[PDB]
Design a protein around this ligand. Structure first.
Ligand SMILES: [Ca+2]
Lengths: 39, 682, 101, 95, 253, 101, 50
């Protein structure tokens, strides 16, 4: 009989695909705003 | 052991669907061009996907070299393989360029829809221009064409500059596997409208060797009864007649002595079967309660320019407003939800499955000929079966909803002649998916009379026969004749193998001596052990008599029967039949049957005046009832149309069960071709 | 061309040997062994023969080798050597050679 | 709430089998032989047979397949070297 | 009963397309190169091609959607979400709803948000939800046997039926019975709650389903035993030393 | 989700309000200077757990108009667990640390 | 083990040696001593093989 604590580390991923705004199209950006040098 | 050459003919279609520009919409034409009157000018429909650098009279500039002579000499397009249809932009917004390019087919090449359009390559880089011989060599016929805007011409912009460029070529257009759903024009000259014709893939069709190589060797028939006999006997040892379906025999027996679901490669043992869902429609309906939405590639379609505004304090009154200087003057925003589209998913999937798996196999009396297309007249060939019209409205998501049922039209059509037949797919793929197969097989002996003999040392002649017909020895999913389409076969090498045993000498001598004595003869019986009679029935008749004159009845064991569809039932006795055209799965030899559900009654009598078993054994006085339609007062069972009496008789004679109350018979005592396993009431 | 068996590249005799050493079957004509005698790790459960056809490069005089980066099917509706945004234009394909019809 | 008046229909499918009626006094299988067959009214007799079928109509020529299970047995005897003789036999209905 | 979440396999986006296979195009006109007189190349409008043509620039316009995630979400919503207890719902908007919490309508008109269960719940873990444990999993349209039984009668509403019932009492489910003359009388039920069954567990008396018998009959068989042997067995089976013993299976209090 | 920053010894927000009207009417007459769109702006701890960039326009890192074209793609799943029957936990067949009963 | 980065675990490991797997032992007092690995590679298994 054994007891302990285990850490798989960071690189453990058990699910195909993702779970964040999945339905959104794979290129659509987010509402943002950026600087550009004046012409 | 046999080897040789086989060619299946043109009508072999292993894979469903097609594989040439699968994703393209089923109606959009590709780049092309055609001609009109006043005056015969040329209209061109195409699109330039690929950007470039600059243009000049010699062509499109697509790169430069520093180490060149003319400053940095411009590299141009080697029309052979230049801007390829497989290149484009690199993002959704992708600010527009100045100069583009593309390819286009010339008017001389016949138009075809994109979906299923193939042209073989011609040079090593994927070029497809039709090479033409000029001056003792090969050369290409690419022609460059130039274009500019419309309003371009309308104003003083007379400095008209070449803004668009195309390369025109010719290809050998082929559509190996699809026909045309709709074709507005009777002619074949590319009109304007001819940019609408849509395609449809040919129905799949598997073709292979039958189960257990049935039909390869002659058998029940004087055709040429083979001979096994002593080397100098000059008198045969094998006698066969013409009413002993040796084959149905070896068949069922395999069944029994083991299991059939597992396939075995060597003998092509793969029992023909039909998916349960094809035969009976479990129309549970679809499953959808949420909308499904496609979206713009940026997820925002419209956009209204706008302007930054800063609030300057209106003291003592309404606040004033000015224009910001920090932001750019023009920005793009949106109002409201992003524009999108709605669609049901599950319903589409279910509809596709229903149409593809059931509709096309309907009885042909409910299909009408197409329009503006040629077609054959022989109602059997592959062509005539692949170019009919079937009303998809006949079967759709709104048929027999929420019921366990089979479309009454289908139930008198061979369910095994299909395309989901797992065994058929297995056998067809084993030989491979080509069209010219050099093949190699081993064939087992099947005659019961010697399939388990224990021969003793000596010399013997063993001589046998094989058929060459392609109608029988092969199997087709669609059942179309193959004499017309002409699949061919030629055996080359045939060799025999035998496997001895390494038994110690004196032991073998003792056994052989002990076995030569007459009181140790061998005995055998065939597992089937029956006769074989067949009786014609004219169409749309009801009842049939059979009468056999007075004779003995020693040890008679009993009767069994079923029904068959002429057409597909080789006659037998003879070694060949010119009349056999069909080529479905032969019920008479494989063991498949589907007609049983179409009986009303049967009565038995000895010498025309004594019933049997008679003496008031059953509920009915003198006749076996199988199913009385509705009027039946008290004689149904298991919510079916079958009588109790017939059900009881079948249960008894199949498992010796019933006198002690019914219950599901145990597994091993009920094999694949049992009774209870295949008893579906609806 | 003497000894291939079971429609594969394996000779008959090796098949005989394996069948014997697994189940003492073969001097009575081959047939499917009974289920309980054959378990997960046994031989016959894990026997998969396969075959296919490919375009001969000597008879078909028109044949020409084509590298990957020039082949194009379903052009104008997919990426280019990378699962990126769709690109290209519509056009007839150039691969693969048909084996039917 | 607003369905209509209706009627019902029933049927069944029993593919992949044959309809078999055994020649037994009580229909039960109790051996390769059978009592009625062994009795034959003691085989100094003979009889003539009539059977009548009635089935639903179709729209194609068809065949009725009937088979009688009988005995078909072969005896093999190979007395001398490289010689084999056999005797077939079967009943009833045979030759 | 238990959710094996994995996400899905959706690594290639899927695009839909316009029926013409090309977005929009801009009429253009053909030209040709009048040979450059040493200097600038001259350009002259052609006559061979018509004044108008259709050509497109850049990729065709194509809206897009994912596939696998939508299927999985639909399945999750329609097989699990609807079956939560009532205490995680609310009445809908501006529609009169049922007032009895047992009948069909109150089981239908209620609305449950997707947010409780979506494609992102318990990401990748064989596990079952907490509220669902204490709710029966048999009362569920996903059932196989219940579906088979429902289909067996048929899809109608007004159905004539005709069945047989086996005797189940242990003490006579296998007894024999020598010759004689005895009486068998029994009583059958008629409430729709008991005999019938609903996949949702709504009341049926309120919804008016009913049933009525017309005629009822009893069957039975025998074994055509030869007379004398039956006589011998009947005589033998009466010596009280040969009584019969029976014991039900479960047997307990 | 706005970032909280400390000032005055307390943690507060940095939400700003910005206003927009139609440059669309950039030109015309006064008075008609009325806002129609209000935007609230913020800063948030953007963080991607399981995605990687399939496409990248330029080797730079700042936020240009081009950066809107970037495309992402999920990371392949990677399972990790204990072997079957806890193979390997206990030494065997090695003279170094043979067990003793 | 769930789908966490950190997991407390608590297991039982059988005895695999053949010389003692089915032995029937008799009354008395005995010394029973063994070893265990701590390497993270051998004990664990990864789907990808990293
Ligand atoms: Ca605007």
């Amino acid at each position: 009989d054994i007891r302990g604590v285990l850490d798989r580390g960071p690189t453990f991923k058990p699910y195909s695909g993702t779970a964040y705004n999945a339905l959104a199209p794979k290129g659509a950006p987010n509402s943002c705003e950026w600087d550009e040098d004046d012409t | 052991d046999i080897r040789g050459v086989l060619d299946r003919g043109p009508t072999f279609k292993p894979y469903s669907g097609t594989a040439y520009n699968a994703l393209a919409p089923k109606g959009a034409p590709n780049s092309c061009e055609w001609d009109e009157d006043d005056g015969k000018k040329t209209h061109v429909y195409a699109q330039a996907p690929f950007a470039g650098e600059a243009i000049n009279k010699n062509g499109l500039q697509i790169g430069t070299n520093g180490a060149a002579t003319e400053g940095n000499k411009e590299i141009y397009a080697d029309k052979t393989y230049q801007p390829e249809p497989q290149i484009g932009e690199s993002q959704w917004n992708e600010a527009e360029s100045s100069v583009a390019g593309g390819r286009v087919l010339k008017k001389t090449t016949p138009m075809k829809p994109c979906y299923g359009s193939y042209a073989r390559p011609t040079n090593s880089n994927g070029g497809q221009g039709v090479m033409v011989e000029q001056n003792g060599k090969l050369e290409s016929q690419v022609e460059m064409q130039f274009f500019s805007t419309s309003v371009n011409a309308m104003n003083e912009a007379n400095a008209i500059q070449p803004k668009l460029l195309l390369y025109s070529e010719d290809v050998n257009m082929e559509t190996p596997d699809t026909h045309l759903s709709y074709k507005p024009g009777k002619s074949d000259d590319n009109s304007k409208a001819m940019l609408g014709q849509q395609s449809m893939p040919n129905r799949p069709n598997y073709i292979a060797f039958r189960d257990n190589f049935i039909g390869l060797m002659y058998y029940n028939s004087t055709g040429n009864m083979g001979v096994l006999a002593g080397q100098a006997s000059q008198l045969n040892a094998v006698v066969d007649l013409q009413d002993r379906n040796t084959e149905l025999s070896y068949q069922l027996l395999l069944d029994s002595i083991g299991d059939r679901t597992r396939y075995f490669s060597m003998w092509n043992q793969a029992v023909d079967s039909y998916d349960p869902d094809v035969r009976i429609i479990e129309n549970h309906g679809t499953e959808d309660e949420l909308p499904n939405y496609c979206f713009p590639l940026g997820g925002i379609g419209v956009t209204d320019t706008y302007q930054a505004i800063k609030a300057t304090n209106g003291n003592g009154g309404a606040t004033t407003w000015a224009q910001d200087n920090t932001f750019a003057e023009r920005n793009e925003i949106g109002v409201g939800n992003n524009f999108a589209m709605e669609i049901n998913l599950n319903a589409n999937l279910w509809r596709n499955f229903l149409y593809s798996n059931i509709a096309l196999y309907l009885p042909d009396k409910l299909k009408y000929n197409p329009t503006n297309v040629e077609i054959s007249d022989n109602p059997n060939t592959y062509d005539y079966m692949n170019k009919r019209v079937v009303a998809p409205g006949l079967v759709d998501c709104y048929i027999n909803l929420g019921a366990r049922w089979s479309l009454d039209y289908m139930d008198n059509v061979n369910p095994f002649n299909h395309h989901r037949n797992a065994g058929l797919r297995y056998r067809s793929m084993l030989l491979g998916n080509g069209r010219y197969v050099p093949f190699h097989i081993q064939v087992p002996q099947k005659f019961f009379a010697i399939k388990n003999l224990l021969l003793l040392p000596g010399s013997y002649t063993y001589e046998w026969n094989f058929r060459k017909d392609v109608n029988m020895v092969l199997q087709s999913s669609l059942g179309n004749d193959l004499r017309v389409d002409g699949a061919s076969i030629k055996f080359d090498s045939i060799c025999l193998y035998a496997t001895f045993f390494p038994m110690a000498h004196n032991t073998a001598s003792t056994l052989e001596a002990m076995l030569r004595n007459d009181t140790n003869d061998q005995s055998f019986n065939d597992y089937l052990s029956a006769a074989n009679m067949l009786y014609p029935i004219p169409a749309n008749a009801t009842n049939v008599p059979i009468s056999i004159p007075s004779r003995n009845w020693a040890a008679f064991r009993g009767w069994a029967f079923t029904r068959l569809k002429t057409k597909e039932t080789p006659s037998l006795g003879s070694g060949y039949d010119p009349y056999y055209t069909y080529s479905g799965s032969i019920p008479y030899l494989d063991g498949t049957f589907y007609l049983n559900h179409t009986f009303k009654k049967v009565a038995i009598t000895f010498d025309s005046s004594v019933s049997w078993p008679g003496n008031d054994r059953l509920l009915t006085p003198n006749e076996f009832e199988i199913k009385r339609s509705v009027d039946g007062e008290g004689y149904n069972v298991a919510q079916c149309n079958m009588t109790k009496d017939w059900f009881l008789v079948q249960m008894l004679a199949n498992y010796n069960i019933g006198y002690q109350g019914f219950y599901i018979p145990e597994s091993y005592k009920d094999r694949m071709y049992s009774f209870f396993r295949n008893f579906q009431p609806m | 061309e003497g000894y291939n068996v079971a429609q594969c590249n394996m000779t008959k005799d090796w098949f005989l040997v394996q069948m014997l050493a697994n189940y003492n079957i073969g001097y009575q004509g081959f047939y499917i062994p009974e289920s309980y005698k054959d378990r997960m790790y046994s031989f016959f459960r894990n026997f998969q023969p396969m075959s296919r056809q490919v375009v001969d490069d000597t008879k078909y005089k028109d044949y020409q080798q084509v590298g990957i980066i020039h082949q194009h099917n379903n052009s104008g509706f997919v990426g280019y050597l990378a699962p990126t945004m769709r690109e290209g234009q519509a056009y007839p394909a150039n691969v693969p050679y048909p084996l039917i019809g | 709430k607003t369905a209509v008046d209706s009627i019902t229909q029933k049927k069944f499918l029993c593919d992949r089998t044959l309809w078999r009626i055994p020649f037994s006094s009580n229909f039960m299988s109790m051996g390769a032989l059978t009592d009625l067959g062994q009795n034959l009214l003691y085989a100094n007799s003979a009889h003539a047979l009539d059977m009548t079928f009635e089935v639903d109509p179709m729209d194609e020529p068809t065949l009725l397949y009937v088979l009688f299970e009988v005995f078909d047995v072969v005896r093999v005897h190979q007395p001398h070297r490289g010689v084999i003789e056999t005797v077939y036999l079967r009943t009833p209905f045979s030759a």
